[PDB]
Swiss-Prot record, chain B:
Main location: other
NCBIfam families, A to Z: FlgEFG_subfam (TIGR03506), PRK12640.1 (NF009280)
Subunit structure: The basal body constitutes a major portion of the flagellar organelle and consists of five rings (E,L,P,S, and M) mounted on a central rod. The rod consists of about 26 subunits of FlgG in the distal portion, and FlgB, FlgC and FlgF are thought to build up the proximal portion of the rod with about 6 subunits each.
Example of a GO biological process term: bacterial-type flagellum-dependent swarming motility
Localization per record: Bacterial flagellum basal body
Coiled-coil features, chain-numbered ranges: none
The gene coding this protein: flgF
InterPro entries: Flag_bb_rod_N (IPR001444), Flagellar_basal_body_rod_CS (IPR019776), Flagellar_FlgE/F/G (IPR020013), Flg_bb/hook_C_dom (IPR010930), FlgE/F/G-like (IPR037925), LlgE_F_G-like_D1 (IPR053967)
Organism, as annotated: Salmonella typhimurium (strain LT2 / SGSC1412 / ATCC 700720)
A GO CC term assigned to this protein in UniProt: bacterial-type flagellum basal body
Name of the protein described by the UniProt record: Flagellar basal-body rod protein FlgF
Taxonomic lineage of the native organism: Bacteria, Pseudomonadati, Pseudomonadota, Gammaproteobacteria, Enterobacterales
UniProtKB/Swiss-Prot annotation, chain C:
Superkingdom field: Bacteria
Source organism: Salmonella typhimurium (strain LT2 / SGSC1412 / ATCC 700720)
Subcellular location field: Bacterial flagellum basal body
UniProt-recorded name of the protein: Flagellar basal-body rod protein FlgG
Subunit-structure text: The basal body constitutes a major portion of the flagellar organelle and consists of four rings (L,P,S, and M) mounted on a central rod. The rod consists of about 26 subunits of FlgG in the distal portion, and FlgB, FlgC and FlgF are thought to build up the proximal portion of the rod with about 6 subunits each.
Similarity comment text for this entry: Belongs to the flagella basal body rod proteins family.
From Swiss-Prot, chain E:
Family: Belongs to the flagella basal body rod proteins family.
This protein's name: Flagellar basal-body rod protein FlgC
Major location (coarse): other
UniProt subcellular location: Bacterial flagellum basal body
UniProt source species: Salmonella typhimurium (strain LT2 / SGSC1412 / ATCC 700720)
Regions that span the bilayer: none
Disulfide bond positions: none
Lineage: Bacteria, Pseudomonadati, Pseudomonadota, Gammaproteobacteria, Enterobacterales
This protein's record includes keyword NAD: no
UniProt entry keywords in alphabetical sequence: Bacterial flagellum
Biological processes per GO annotation: bacterial-type flagellum-dependent swarming motility
Subunit structure: The basal body constitutes a major portion of the flagellar organelle and consists of four rings (L,P,S, and M) mounted on a central rod. The rod consists of about 26 subunits of FlgG in the distal portion, and FlgB, FlgC and FlgF are thought to build up the proximal portion of the rod with about 6 subunits each.
GO cellular component: bacterial-type flagellum; bacterial-type flagellum basal body, rod
Length: 243, 249, 48, 96, 67
């Protein structure tokens, strides 16, 4: 009856918390964009008056706003100033896209992500490297002993999407292209709308804290009100059954 | 006189639903549990003359296949699967089965078993070098490190058999292990091939997907329906008691 | 039953049962006690 | 059950891993030739709710996990010990 | 007859019986109306029973007119 409406209401508020809890758990994650749940009411029944049916979440939109930078003396970490995604080769063979700028080198040269996934285009670092320079425009140069000039290696090309909110979150700090975010556009950082690169800095999470606390306050109070609604409907049905 | 049975059926089947709901809530902490969905279906009685009697019967259209909240336990053998993924384990009757419980244990002789079911990889059940720090990669690659020896070893051993199959194509067996349906067996073969596109995370255990809001609403609805059917039964019984005096000439 | 429509049937469960309680054998932290008779094991081993 | 306790627990575990790294770095301020550790955090799998094309999909997170702990191999400062057996390295290199 | 009222719509897209929009159809059975109908039917049944019981004595007493 009116129980199948408060049930949808309760589902909505638990979805809101699962979004808020996800945002609060990823405070220390580098390059994390906060999710925001969007709710929509269901079909109305017309007999004229209109009787509602409940609420249904539509799509959690993520905010692609540039977070703050934090300084780590590591020379393998870079941060993006603007919109753009580093391209990463998955074990299957398809390409994912990430904003976590914490990179390493694996045993065969080569820049990889924190989970060891390779970063494309592939940038092979020599063993006799003394200092690695990742420039403003993505030029990765290496200094070698004796040489009075640095040896160029490669370009860190950034991928720009037309709609960044439509990317599918794999999980492990990777976004993959979807129908709503097709046609990834490779570009040198600084041109064709791509952002620039800062070496030695890591982008921090976008999540604002006070907003999430107030949001949990609101979610808890709405959840309590909906539980009261369920209790009142149950009590009415219990009174009816005694007839 | 038979209207006292129709309502009775509903009441009885109400209890059935309650049992199912309890069976869900008893498994609130079970790892990799898939809550069974319940649904009443109405069956009309066909025959002359006025189709007035329509009974109910409860059924369980499979399980709810939304992945649960993950539990981060710092154990490398614990695995959590990407949505719509299954581990393949040898069941009791020497046949394949699919499970979500990723709590893998190592036997004394090195056999990988989940809940006593030996896990099956690409080459069959897995034999681990007795005593080894097992590390599972993101796609199921198993690396074994033998104690005492150097770490430049971490030689790989095998790869788990991860299967993609949606909730419509799978039915539960009486042992709690999921299998393919007859239609899905006909359309996708008997034994499913391992999909390399399924990602598996090591060090996290997946919990159950029992929604408590749904359980509470189901209990309230079941109680109210049971009371309504009891009232109908009482009314019918009283009416027949009054009606059984006409026979007095 | 024989198959657009939902599947029929009724498979009631029976309940929950604990199967095995496991201990996580991960190396713990070291606490310093200056007495010369306490030692701590660095790895996978037990005293007999 | 379905509850944001299993997400906030991973949040607490992540912050505790960070605090463990911080404490380990603090305990070794006087150790000679020590490289500071940094914890890299990356969130868990995402569950996708299938809807009845859409500009954005409905995806709910599950938590975060520590995956990579890095040691910064940067050249630390030199301190003078008149003991003639002590040596220091200018650049990358390890004694065997 | 089968009632012609807006079937109740519940948003359950996972159900195989959900339409393109995903709304499963639940019956239009109102609870209060059916309890009232049960009570009214019972009281009409009992009233007709009482009418038959009342008539019966007169029926049996009619047949004593001849003998």
């Amino acid at each position: 009856s009116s129980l199948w409406i408060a049930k949808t209401g309760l589902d909505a508020q638990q979805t809101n918390m699962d979004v808020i809890a996800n945002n609060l758990a990823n405070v220390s994650t580098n390059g994390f964009k906060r999710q925001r749940a969007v709710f929509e009411d269901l079909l109305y029944q017309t007999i004229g008056l209109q009787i509602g049916t409940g609420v249904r979440p539509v799509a959690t939109e993520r905010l692609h706003s540039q977070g703050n930078l934090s300084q780590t003396n590591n020379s393998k970490d870079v941060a993006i100033k603007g919109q753009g995604f580093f391209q990463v080769m998955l074990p299957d063979g398809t390409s994912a896209y990430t904003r976590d700028g914490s990179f390493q080198v694996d045993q065969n040269g080569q820049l990889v992500t924190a989970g060891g996934f390779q970063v494309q285009p592939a940038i092979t670092i020599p063993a006799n490297a003394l200092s690695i320079t990742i420039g403003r425009d993505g030029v990765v140069s290496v200094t070698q002993q004796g040489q009075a000039a640095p040896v160029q290696v490669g370009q860190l090309n950034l991928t720009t999407f037309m709609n960044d909110t439509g990317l599918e979150s794999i999980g492990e700090n990777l976004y993959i292209e979807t129908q709503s975010s097709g046609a990834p556009n490779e570009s040198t950082p600084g041109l064709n709308g791509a952002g620039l690169l800062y070496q030695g800095y890591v982008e921090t999470s976008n999540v604002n804290v006070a907003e999430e606390l107030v949001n949990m306050i609101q979610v808890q109070r709405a959840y309590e009100i909906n539980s009261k609604a369920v209790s009142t409907t149950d009590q009415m049905l219990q009174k009816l059954t005694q007839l | 006189d038979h209207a006292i049975y129709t309502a009775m059926g509903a009441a009885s089947q109400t209890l059935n639903q309650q049992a199912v709901t309890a069976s869900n809530l008893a498994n609130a902490s079970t790892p990799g549990f898939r809550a069974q969905l319940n649904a009443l279906r109405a069956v009309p009685v066909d025959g002359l003359s006025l189709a007035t009697r329509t009974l109910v019967t409860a059924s369980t259209p499979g399980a709810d296949m939304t992945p649960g909240q993950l539990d981060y336990t710092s154990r490398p053998l614990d695995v959590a699967l990407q949505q719509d993924g299954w581990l393949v384990v040898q069941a009791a009757d020497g046949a394949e089965g699919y499970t979500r419980n990723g709590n893998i244990q190592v036997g004394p002789t090195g056999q990988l078993t989940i809940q006593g079911h030996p896990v099956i990889g690409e080459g069959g059940p897995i034999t681990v070098p007795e005593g080894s720090e097992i590390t599972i990669a993101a796609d199921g690659t198993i690396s074994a490190l033998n104690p005492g020896d150097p770490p430049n070893t971490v030689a790989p051993v095998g790869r788990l058999k991860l299967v993609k199959a949606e909730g419509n194509e799978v039915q539960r067996s009486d042992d709690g292990l999921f299998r393919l349906t007859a239609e899905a067996q006909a359309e996708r073969g008997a034994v499913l091939a391992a999909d390399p596109s399924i990602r598996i995370m090591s060090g996290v255990l997946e919990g159950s997907n029992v929604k408590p809001v749904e359980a509470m609403t189901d209990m309230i609805a079941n109680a109210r329906r049971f009371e309504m059917q009891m009232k109908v039964i009482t009314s019918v019984d009283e009416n027949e008691g009054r009606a059984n005096q006409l026979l007095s000439m | 039953g024989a198959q657009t429509t939902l599947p029929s049937g009724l498979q009631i469960g029976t309940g929950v049962r604990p199967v095995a309680t496991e201990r996580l054998h991960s190396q713990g932290n070291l606490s310093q006690t200056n007495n010369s008779k306490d030692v701590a094991i660095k790895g996978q081993g037990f005293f007999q | 059950m379905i509850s944001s306790l299993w997400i906030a627990k991973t949040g607490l575990d992540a912050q505790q891993t960070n605090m463990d790294v911080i404490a380990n770095n603090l305990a070794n301020v006087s150790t000679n030739g020590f490289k500071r550790q940094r914890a890299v955090f990356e969130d868990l799998l995402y569950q996708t709710i299938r809807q009845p094309t859409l500009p954005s999909g409905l995806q709910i997170g599950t938590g975060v996990r520590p995956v990579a702990t890095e040691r910064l191999h940067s050249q630390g400062n030199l301190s003078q010990t008149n003991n003639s057996k002590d040596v220091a390295i200018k650049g990358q290199g390890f004694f065997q | 007859i089968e009632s012609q009222a807006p079937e109740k719509l519940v948003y359950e897209p996972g159900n195989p019986l959900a339409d393109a929009n995903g709304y499963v159809k639940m019956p239009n059975v109102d609870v209060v109306g059916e309890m009232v109908n049960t009570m009214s039917a019972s009281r009409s049944y009992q009233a007709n029973i009482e009418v038959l019981n009342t008539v019966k004595s007169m029926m049996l007493k009619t047949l004593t007119l001849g003998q």
